[PDB]
Design a protein. Sequence first.
Lengths: 52, 52
Amino acid sequence: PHLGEGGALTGTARKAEEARLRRAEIERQTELGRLQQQIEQRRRRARAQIEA
Amino acid sequence: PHLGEGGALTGTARKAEEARLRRAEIERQTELGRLQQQIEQRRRRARAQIEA
């Protein structure tokens, strides 16, 4: 059975929709990872400054 | 025998001159030590900055 919104999709369209969902959710994960790395950088400067 | 400039000094004056010489040379040593510590400080900032 077709799972997810826009269930009318069938055939090649179903695979295309699956690929699009994978791409978008992957890039959302990349967004969150980049924010985490940003906070990483800020904390590094903070405690290095404390060391000085 | 009296050693050092102003050999005419005798009695208490000789001890006073010895004490004055000791004080002055000690403070010259303090001068040099303070300069060395200053360069100490500059080098510390330099390589800490390099670490960052």
